[PDB]
């Protein structure tokens, strides 16, 4: 059984950045330390950082006074941010740079009372946090999740509109999208094509040149990871069988019976040592060496806070 | 989806008794009227009132000379009184009754000059209140939030030593630092068991039998209200979810997904108005009609004074 690694894969760097900022701060201040939410979506790294001392707390209601605080990586609408302000806490902010970028676009359109679109999942935590940006009450904030969802979009000036998107959407899908938004509001106005990442857009192009190659796709990511889910769904688009698995425990000897070709990759919140251990349960279970395909290069990296070095 | 709706749930004696004052007061004598801190913690209360030509400040030096000032329920320093007093205005105390009764004793053992310690969090408006009410440099006040706070307290005479609690706190809690306070200090007084009223008692004694019948357990409460996270905390450490929230739409889907039992109450300080309003988008959401739970009789009011009625 041939074993083949798609490039690139895992950690983006908003994600390494946000675990970061977690470990560090519970270096440079001792357990325990509160973190909104899950930091990242990947329950190995969540758990990991309980056991270190991390505390994930659903509401700010929950962190005592005179502790530290840590906002996901998901990014915080403007009321947790400013609730968090008014407190007595000591706020570190782990939401990624890219988020963020969306989040001022928003924060912008507010401020000029135009209406703005979000194409995004209903429910995730980037959304409440992008959509927790829009404030002017004179305007509207706006959510929609597929073409269908446009045809029924009704607002208040369609002369005044302007739209954005989750960072972890599917390529496809958001392109159709579009499309629409532009069709029903030819007047909109967006960035030149989405707000997807350059992580996910990389990892969804690997995990195509991967599938085209392979019977079988194991995607390393939690359930709740919008971007893990895009690579095994995209995978399964193009016949493939995939699989969304946290750890190499997870894999089933009948899912690679069989099979003389297996992919893996992993979503941008799952640790290159799930990936290892998955490679090496897969060679237990007949696979052979590991071979990583080629694939485009990324050179970004975001730094911690300078307080958290 | 079944909806369950904690008895007693809303407001308290205090917070009705507050809030009367300020309305009261605004009717008689027109706006503006200024509020030393929100008269209640509640921003629907809040920025009602402030609609209504109420001004929320924290200092009296922001309050203009000749102006009506309303002391919160969660009551004031003797400092702060006093500036009031020192200058130009017409001062309203809506002080919770219950407050004023932990007040006097405070005032009473600095007059003695015999030590006093507060059982509270500090920070809170009725903490630094209560604080305020001891002046005797003779003597001594202090406060401990925990177990771990009395350990560490250190005091003059531990012979001539009595205490006090806030009046919002978790029960249970307060029970645990008072054992500790009667171990490191056995000739401490204070009183039978608490300075906790009836109020906070009742809810959070309400919120435990909605707990173990409810999955998850909604408080309508604002975040800076301290009987409403005491509220949530109970019921989280139920190994229930709970969350406070400020209206039905701080209410996201997900928390009650396939849940078949949901639990609501309200803190001390919350309008009955965004209970119902809550209980709306849970129908909406699935949820039946809302049953209430049996509860222990609330019948104390507190009058607003003869200067305001209306
Ligand atoms: C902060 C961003 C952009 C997401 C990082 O990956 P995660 O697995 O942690 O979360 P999602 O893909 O679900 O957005
Ligand atoms: C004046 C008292 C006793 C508190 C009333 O409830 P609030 O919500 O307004 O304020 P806290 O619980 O934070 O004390
Ligand atoms: S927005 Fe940020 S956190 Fe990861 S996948 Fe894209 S980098
Ligand atoms: S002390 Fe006073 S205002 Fe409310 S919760 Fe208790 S009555």
Same mark, same amino acid.
């Given at each position: 059984?041939?074993?083949?690694?798609?490039?690139?894969?895992?950690?983006? *760097?908003?994600?390494?950045? /946000?675990?970061?900022?977690?470990?560090?701060?519970?270096?440079?201040?001792? *357990?325990?330390?509160?973190?909104?939410?899950?930091? #990242?979506?990947?329950?190995?790294?969540?758990?990991?950082?309980?056991?270190?001392?991390?505390?994930?707390?659903?509401?700010?209601?929950?962190?005592?006074?005179?502790?530290?605080?840590?906002?996901?990586?998901?990014?915080?609408?403007?009321?947790?941010?400013?609730?968090?302000?008014?407190?007595?806490?000591?706020?570190?902010?782990?939401?990624?740079?890219?988020?963020?970028?969306?989040?001022?676009?928003?924060?912008?359109?507010?401020?000029?009372?135009?209406?703005?679109?979000?194409?995004?999942?209903?429910?995730?935590?980037?959304?409440?946090?992008?959509?927790?940006?829009?404030?002017?009450?004179?305007?509207?904030?706006?959510?929609?999740?597929?073409?269908?969802?446009?045809?029924?979009?009704?607002?208040?000036?369609?002369?005044?509109?302007?739209?954005?998107?989750?960072?972890?959407?599917?390529?496809?899908?958001?392109?159709?999208?579009?499309?629409?938004?532009?069709?029903?509001?030819?007047?909109?106005?967006?960035?030149?094509?989405?707000?997807?990442?350059?992580?996910?857009?990389?990892?969804?192009?690997?995990?195509?040149?991967?599938?085209?190659?392979?019977? #079988?796709?194991?995607?390393?990511?939690?359930?709740?990871?919008?971007?893990?889910?895009?690579? *095994?769904?995209? /995978?399964?688009?193009?016949?493939?069988? /995939?699989?969304?698995?946290?750890?190499?425990?997870?894999?089933?000897?009948?899912?690679?019976?069989?099979?003389?070709?297996?992919?893996?990759? *992993?979503?941008?919140?799952?640790?290159?040592?799930?990936?290892?251990? #998955?490679?090496?349960?897969?060679?237990?279970?007949?696979?052979?060496?590991?071979?990583?395909?080629?694939?485009?290069?990324?050179?970004?990296?975001?730094?911690?806070?300078?307080?958290?070095?």
């Amino acid at each position: 059984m041939q074993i083949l690694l798609a490039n690139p894969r895992g950690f983006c *760097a908003g994600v390494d950045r /946000a675990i970061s900022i977690v470990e560090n701060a519970l270096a440079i201040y001792g *357990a325990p330390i509160y973190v909104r939410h899950e930091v #990242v979506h990947n329950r190995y790294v969540v758990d990991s950082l309980r056991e270190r001392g991390a505390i994930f707390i659903e509401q700010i209601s929950e962190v005592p006074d005179g502790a530290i605080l840590i906002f996901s990586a998901h990014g915080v609408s403007q009321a947790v941010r400013n609730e968090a302000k008014s407190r007595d806490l000591t706020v570190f902010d782990a939401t990624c740079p890219l988020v963020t970028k969306v989040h001022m676009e928003v924060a912008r359109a507010s401020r000029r009372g135009e209406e703005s679109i979000l194409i995004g999942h209903a429910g995730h935590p980037e959304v409440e946090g992008t959509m927790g940006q829009y404030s002017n009450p004179e305007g509207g904030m706006y959510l929609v999740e597929s073409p269908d969802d446009v045809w029924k979009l009704t607002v208040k000036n369609e002369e005044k509109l302007s739209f954005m998107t989750q960072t972890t959407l599917s390529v496809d899908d958001t392109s159709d999208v579009i499309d629409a938004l532009r069709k029903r509001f030819p007047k909109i106005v967006g960035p030149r094509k989405d707000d997807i990442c350059y992580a996910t857009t990389n990892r969804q192009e690997a995990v195509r040149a991967l599938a085209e190659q392979a019977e #079988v796709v194991l995607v390393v990511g939690s359930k709740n990871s919008s971007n893990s889910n895009r690579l *095994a769904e995209l /995978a399964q688009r193009m016949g493939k069988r /995939a699989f969304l698995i946290d750890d190499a425990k997870d894999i089933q000897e009948e899912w690679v019976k069989e099979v003389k070709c297996v992919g893996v990759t *992993a979503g941008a919140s799952a640790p290159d040592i799930l990936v290892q251990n #998955v490679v090496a349960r897969l060679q237990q279970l007949g696979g052979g060496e590991a071979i990583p395909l080629e694939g485009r290069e990324e050179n970004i990296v975001f730094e911690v806070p300078k307080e958290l070095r």
